[PDB]
Amino acid sequence: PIVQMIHQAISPRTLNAWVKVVEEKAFSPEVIPMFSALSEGATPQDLNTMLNAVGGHQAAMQMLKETINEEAAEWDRLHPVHAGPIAPGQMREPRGSDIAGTTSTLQEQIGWMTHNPPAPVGEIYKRWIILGLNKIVRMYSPTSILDIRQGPKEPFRDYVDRFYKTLRAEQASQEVKNWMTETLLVQNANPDCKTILKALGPGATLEEMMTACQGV
Amino acid sequence: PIVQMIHQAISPRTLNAWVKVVEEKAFSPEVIPMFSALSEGATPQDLNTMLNAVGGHQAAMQMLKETINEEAAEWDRLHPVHAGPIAPGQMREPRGSDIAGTTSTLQEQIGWMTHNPPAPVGEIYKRWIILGLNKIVRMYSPTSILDIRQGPKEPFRDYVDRFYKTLRAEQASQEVKNWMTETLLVQNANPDCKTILKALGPGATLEEMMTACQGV
Amino acid sequence: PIVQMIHQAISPRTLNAWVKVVEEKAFSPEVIPMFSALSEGATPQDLNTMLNAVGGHQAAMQMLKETINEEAAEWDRLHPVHAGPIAPGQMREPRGSDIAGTTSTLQEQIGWMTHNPPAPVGEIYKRWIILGLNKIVRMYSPTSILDIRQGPKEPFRDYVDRFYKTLRAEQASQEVKNWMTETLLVQNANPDCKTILKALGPGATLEEMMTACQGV
Amino acid sequence: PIVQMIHQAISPRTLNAWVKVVEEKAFSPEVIPMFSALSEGATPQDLNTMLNAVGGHQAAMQMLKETINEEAAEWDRLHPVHAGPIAPGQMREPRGSDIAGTTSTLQEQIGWMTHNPPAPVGEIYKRWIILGLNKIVRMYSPTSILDIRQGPKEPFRDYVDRFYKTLRAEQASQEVKNWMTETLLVQNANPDCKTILKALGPGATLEEMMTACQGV
Amino acid sequence: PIVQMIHQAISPRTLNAWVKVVEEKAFSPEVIPMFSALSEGATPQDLNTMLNAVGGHQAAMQMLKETINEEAAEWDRLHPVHAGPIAPGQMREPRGSDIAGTTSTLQEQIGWMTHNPPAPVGEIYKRWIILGLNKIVRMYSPTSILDIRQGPKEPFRDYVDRFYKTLRAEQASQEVKNWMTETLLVQNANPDCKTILKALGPGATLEEMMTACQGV
Amino acid sequence: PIVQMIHQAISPRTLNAWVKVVEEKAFSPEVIPMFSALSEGATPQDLNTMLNAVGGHQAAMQMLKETINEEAAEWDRLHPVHAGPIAPGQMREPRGSDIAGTTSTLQEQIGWMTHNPPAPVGEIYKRWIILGLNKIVRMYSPTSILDIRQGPKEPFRDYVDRFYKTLRAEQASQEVKNWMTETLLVQNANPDCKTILKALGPGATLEEMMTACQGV
Ligand SMILES: [Cl-]
Ligand SMILES: [Cl-]
Ligand SMILES: [Cl-]
Ligand SMILES: [Cl-]
Ligand SMILES: [Cl-]
Ligand SMILES: [Cl-]
Ligand SMILES: [Cl-]
Ligand SMILES: [Cl-]
Ligand SMILES: [Cl-]
Ligand SMILES: [Cl-]
Ligand SMILES: [Cl-]
Ligand SMILES: [Cl-]
Ligand SMILES: [Cl-]
Ligand SMILES: [Cl-]
Ligand SMILES: [Cl-]
Ligand SMILES: [Cl-]
Ligand SMILES: [Cl-]
Ligand SMILES: [Cl-]
Ligand SMILES: [Cl-]
Ligand SMILES: [Cl-]
Ligand SMILES: [Cl-]
Ligand SMILES: [Cl-]
Ligand SMILES: [Cl-]
Ligand SMILES: [Cl-]
Ligand SMILES: [Cl-]
Ligand SMILES: [Cl-]
Ligand SMILES: [Cl-]
Ligand SMILES: [Cl-]
Ligand SMILES: [Cl-]
Ligand SMILES: [Cl-]
Ligand SMILES: [Cl-]
Ligand SMILES: [Cl-]
Ligand SMILES: [Cl-]
Ligand SMILES: [Cl-]
Ligand SMILES: [Cl-]
Ligand SMILES: [Cl-]
Ligand SMILES: [Cl-]
Ligand SMILES: [Cl-]
Ligand SMILES: [Cl-]
Ligand SMILES: [Cl-]
Ligand SMILES: [Cl-]
Ligand SMILES: [Cl-]
Ligand SMILES: [Cl-]
Ligand SMILES: [Cl-]
Ligand SMILES: [Cl-]
Ligand SMILES: [Cl-]
Ligand SMILES: [Cl-]
Ligand SMILES: [Cl-]
Ligand SMILES: [Cl-]
Ligand SMILES: [Cl-]
Ligand SMILES: [Cl-]
Ligand SMILES: [Cl-]
Ligand SMILES: [Cl-]
Ligand SMILES: [Cl-]
Fold first, then answer.
1. Which chains touch D (3 or more CB pairs under 8 A)?
2. Which one, out of A169, E8, E62, E199, has a CA that is 20 to 30 A from the CA of A99?
3. Peptide bond preceding D33: is omega within 30 degrees of 0, i.e. cis?
4. Rounded to an integer, what distance in angstroms lies between the CA atom of residue B118 and that of residue B43?
5. Contact A91, A102 (CB under 8 A)
6. Residue B159: count of CB within 10 angstroms of its CB
């Protein structure tokens, strides 16, 4: 990575940690925060190191390439390159492939990120990676939010854990997710809790809802 | 985090430690000191990293969002924003959402925390998180302090461990907790210890109480 | 902690280490050196972090509060506060509760410890903690030094291990402990070793005593 | 290694990590990113340390020597040495064997890498190592890309994992690999998925292909 | 410890390492190098931390106190204290108990060790500890060097391992140990190897001796 | 060690790593690179720490002393000491025993290694250690290179692993090892592979040889 702003290599355990996360948790939503955490201040080189260190899941890793390539092609389109000699003390304008690390050196990656003002190719690439990871998570989710329904003997707290887990891996803006909580959570609770929660009122908190069906 | 005052990312093992605590201990009271310890000097980014790294317990994690959102809305209310261009060498006035990390950059978070005088959004956000964690702990507590009663064969020391554990997860100011120790501890001890402890006197220490029922 | 003299947070593994010690070894005497080691240069915040990180043993942890509170009340008594505005470049006079961390900030704790001359609230609080830990160790000791007696087939070396372990958790000044070694160790050895050791002389070393009953 | 640019030895755990990778994963493709990661900024000494630390697999490790020796001989050919005394504040022109570490000191390796402009023998040697590792990976691959065929009951996602894993260890330029995905992936899917995917169109994404055979 | 020369506390893992060594290996000779390694640059405080962290083996740990106390009393005898006020920028003359850490502060320990010229109380105390550890090792050794005799079917290499292990824990100057190797090693080898080794000559190396009885 | 050039003690885990290598791998050839890696920049003190930390294998460790002593005696012979007072800002001429650490201080070891120009006693001692380790490895090797012969059903790749492992622990200059590969490898392959490899030609690569007997 680069940290306050001097360069270092990705640490054995930063890397090892990332691999064990992909081994154990596969593509659960918490993989992405974990990724962003382990990749804080990372160069494209460091970012590629993390992705390529994953053996197995090559279907998903290949989808991640396709996504990265789309974002790179879009970048090139939005940022058309200008020809000419690059002056002294200046950098070339980074292409999509320079950002993804495939056609830039570590030195150029350091040159862009440390520049005044910075050309933050680490953060621009990390965006595209996470963008593509969100697709993989959403795709590899087993369940649909419509099918989470409280069982007759199920403690309310467990149903809420199922619901909000399944909700975490859905393709929905916050407004669409707001509506699912607004509509489905109370609707698809079992007849006992369902009637209890309907009596609380339309603007009731989760804490209030969850404590309402505590003895239930 | 930020430490004496230069910025660094959350360490693999700081993060890993937090996750294992939420895995193993779920929401036992000692989770919160552990949290404050692992989050010493953390930015909102770092704070969000810790919370989002938790997969599972999404009922609780969702309650934590609701709490955070209430505190943010309250902040906005108490701190109404003033319009205008922000001058050179100055920051914008942070909103509730900038503090919670959702609408501020890492750079702005560093800008506020390092400023002269500082705008300590890390500590302001960490307050709200812990505030909301205390609710979760209190809610997820299995037992009520009224139901801790010494068994006829139970060594006094074990009863005190049950009592003060259950007391740790109660919604009570220190004065209310003072009263529970004052009243219930000796009251709900078994007839043998109960009479022993009544003979010691109303201002007797725990050490004195516990040693009084040692051979008992 | 603070170390040569700049501030840092308690490390994940410093903390984790402390917890595992309280998990595994409970309140064996070596807990206190371990504590002092893990708390070298700690602020009251750091000290509280360590104590509150312990879940379980709340009987003991509550005794530790009572002790801390007595020492704090005594401090307040010995150091009565003087009213007035605190001048520029100066600190307020720390109370008992500021030392214990409950009514002081991390900044004020750093302000006192780094001052010229220093107001070492970390070391003053660490004293009270260890003071109270010694009570817990002495209390939770299973055996009394009077009851350690060498068995007829017991190798002398094992009896000495029992003796000096039990001696380690006794409430005795060095002079009282000197006397126990002087009197009891040789007295309560078995008839064979007992007569052997009596023949060595009153000023004989442990090495000499232990090697005297080696073939015995 | 050398890092921003001062020298350090390879860390116990950097090394240990490399060994465990060669123990566990043998010569799976992800060994090479892992290698490049663990060898970021490494001197030839550090590079040799990593290779020689491997016991077992001496067939492969011997192939790696042969490859290294070919690249070194080629270097010598392309860079013929010029005789004369080396002036003050100057280095000798590195041979193939100086780059591979066998006939250069650690000091000379530091002298070349830190020079203005640098003579990056670490990166030149790391190239040859990876070059030779790619041969070993390609050689030790069990399966050929032509033989990956979806089974009648096989979920499409698993077939894609087999395909792109086997593709990762093939001797093929990106254009040749492009063609295999273009041709074989859809061709060698089972009759159900095969007809589904043919109906999508020739320019369909993996995501689209994989979701097309999700219920299939 | 103190390291190039600024003070730090003993690390969690430095300490943990020491404890695990005393747990696993008890008092095997390699404990002392391990000790010296883990105590490089340690203050008396740090040294005491290591010794007191050991629970169990209190017979041995008590012998270590007696030894330390003898060395301290001897120091006081050789270095009689001179009365008077200590001048500005000067230290008091350290007593035996100041060196052992019992009557000196951490600050005074830092004051002596960093002084110009230094008063190396860490190294003076570490001497006495190791002095006393050597007694414990020698005492707790199960076997005597006279009783190591090669068995009729025993490979020579195993007998040499027994011999030189037992030799490592003997009270003997290098000259006395030289003589044991000179005399006993070849004498107490079995009749086959014994006659072989006698034929080699009186000045034969271990390598020569060990390879002489390789097929034997 | 000493690193860019300031002194530090050997780390707990550097040491622990070395011990575990000698525990697990005994004296396999990869022990020596591992050693050189773990001893990069080590003082004689640090070097002795590593060797003495090994309990068990005292036959081998004693051979290592004999070797070290021969190299030290040779050094003394080649470097005869010159009498006189050592001037200000100058060091004494190091003897064999000063290099091996037995008659020099840590300070003098730092004085020699940091001097202008340096007297690299760490590297001079590390040479002798490795010199002696190579003898131990060669001695403790179970098999002779003449006895590695491919079995009738043995995959060629496994035979090459046996061959080049056994070759790694032989006393042979590169020219002698070149000849063994030149002669024995193809000679002692089984009749099928033997005839295949003879048809390839005298200058055929290992890769070519190994792929030639892949289907075989
Ligand atoms: Cl690391
Ligand atoms: Cl790894
Ligand atoms: Cl994986
Ligand atoms: Cl998944
Ligand atoms: Cl790759
Ligand atoms: Cl795969
Ligand atoms: Cl450029
Ligand atoms: Cl941008
Ligand atoms: Cl579900
Ligand atoms: Cl870390
Ligand atoms: Cl983690
Ligand atoms: Cl969890
Ligand atoms: Cl819980
Ligand atoms: Cl998230
Ligand atoms: Cl959940
Ligand atoms: Cl701003
Ligand atoms: Cl505030
Ligand atoms: Cl209970
Ligand atoms: Cl840590
Ligand atoms: Cl922890
Ligand atoms: Cl506990
Ligand atoms: Cl206990
Ligand atoms: Cl707390
Ligand atoms: Cl408890
Ligand atoms: Cl103040
Ligand atoms: Cl005081
Ligand atoms: Cl006992
Ligand atoms: Cl390390
Ligand atoms: Cl290792
Ligand atoms: Cl291996
Ligand atoms: Cl393989
Ligand atoms: Cl090697
Ligand atoms: Cl092998
Ligand atoms: Cl040169
Ligand atoms: Cl080049
Ligand atoms: Cl396959
Ligand atoms: Cl540590
Ligand atoms: Cl520990
Ligand atoms: Cl122990
Ligand atoms: Cl022992
Ligand atoms: Cl102690
Ligand atoms: Cl004991
Ligand atoms: Cl003084
Ligand atoms: Cl001295
Ligand atoms: Cl034996
Ligand atoms: Cl370490
Ligand atoms: Cl160790
Ligand atoms: Cl061993
Ligand atoms: Cl071996
Ligand atoms: Cl030793
Ligand atoms: Cl041995
Ligand atoms: Cl000198
Ligand atoms: Cl030399
Ligand atoms: Cl073999």
1. A, F
2. A169
3. no
4. 13
5. no
6. 22
Contact E67, E132 (CB under 8 A): yes
Q: Phi and psi of E7, rounded to 5°?
A: -80, 140
* Resolution to one decimal, Å: 2.8
* Angle subtended at Cα F17 by Cα F14 and Cα F21, rounded to the nearest 5 degrees: 140
Q: How far apart are CA F91 and CA D35, in angstroms?
A: 43
Contacts of A159 (CB under 8 A, 6+ apart): A148, A150, A151, A189
Using H for helix, E for strand and C for coil, what is the string for F52-89? HCCCCCHHHHHHHHHHHHHHHHHHHHHCCCCCCCCCCC
Residue type, D16: N
Each domain of chain C, given as residue ranges in start order, spans 1-144, 145-216
Tokens of C118: 């220093």
Report the distance separating Cα F159 and Cα F179, nearest Å.
18
User: Count of CB atoms within 10 A of residue C182's CB?
Assistant: 12
The beta-carbon neighbor of E30 closest among F7, F9, F54 is F54
For the beta carbon of residue E215, count every other beta carbon within 10 angstroms.
Answer: 6
- d(CA C39, CA C41) in angstroms, rounded, equals 6
Rg (chain B; Cα; Å): 23
Q: Which of B38, B205, B211 sits opposite C66 (nearest CB)?
A: B205
Do the Cβ atoms of F49 and E37 come within 8 Å? yes
CA F25 to ligand 49 centroid distance, Å: 7
Rounded to an integer, what distance in angstroms lies between the CA atom of residue D136 and that of residue D51?
A: 14
Method used to solve the structure: X-ray
Gyration radius (Cα) of chain A, Å:
23
Q: Are A164 and B61 an interchain contact pair (Cβ–Cβ within 8 Å)?
A: yes
What angle, 0 to 180 degrees and rounded to 10, lies between the N-to-C axes of helices A31-38 and A12-24? 170
Residue D151: is it exposed, middle or buried by C-beta count within 10 angstroms (0-12/13-18/19+)? exposed
Task: Tell me which chains share at least 3 CB pairs under 8 Å with chain C.
Answer: B, E
Task: Answer whether C139 touches B (CB < 8 Å).
Answer: yes
What CA–CA distance (Å, rounded) separates F46 from F127? 14
Three-state DSSP state, F27: coil
- What is the number of residues in chain E? 216
CB E176 within 8 A of CB F104: no
Query: What type of residue sits at position F17?
Result: A
**Measuring CA to CA, which residue among B43, B10, B50 is closest to residue B112?**
B43
Interatomic CA distance for residues C155 and B169, integer angstroms:
50
B155: left (phi over 0), alpha (psi -120 to 50) or beta: beta
Amino acid occupying residue A209: M
3-state secondary structure of F142: coil
Beta carbons within 8 Å of E41's beta carbon, 6+ residues apart: E1, E2, E3, E122, F9
Asked if the C-beta of F184 comes within 8 angstroms of chain D's C-beta atoms, the answer is no
Residue B13 marked in a binding site:
yes
C49 touches chain B (CB under 8 A): yes
Rounded to an integer, what distance in angstroms lies between the CA atom of residue C85 and that of residue A194? 61
Nearest CB among E33, E34, E207 relative to F135 is that of E207
- Under 8 Å between Cβ of E112 and E119: yes
Q: Could you tell me which CATH number the domain at C145-216 has?
A: 1.10.1200.30
Closest CA to D136 of F168, F179, F205: F205
CATH assignment, F1-144: 1.10.375.10
Rounded distance between C-alpha atoms, residue B41 and residue C8, angstroms: 9
A6 CB-near residues (< 8 Å, 6+ apart): D4
Read out DSSP for E77-104?
A: HHS----SPPPTT--PPP-HHHHTTSSS
Q: Which residues pair with F7 in a beta bridge?
A: F2
Instruction: Spell out a b/e string for E87-99, using b for 16 or more CB atoms within 10 Å of the CB, else e.
Output: eeeeeeebbbbbb
d(CA E122, CA E48): 11
Q: Is some CB atom of chain E closer than 8 A to the CB atom of C33?
A: yes
**Residue F184 gets which letter from DSSP?**
I
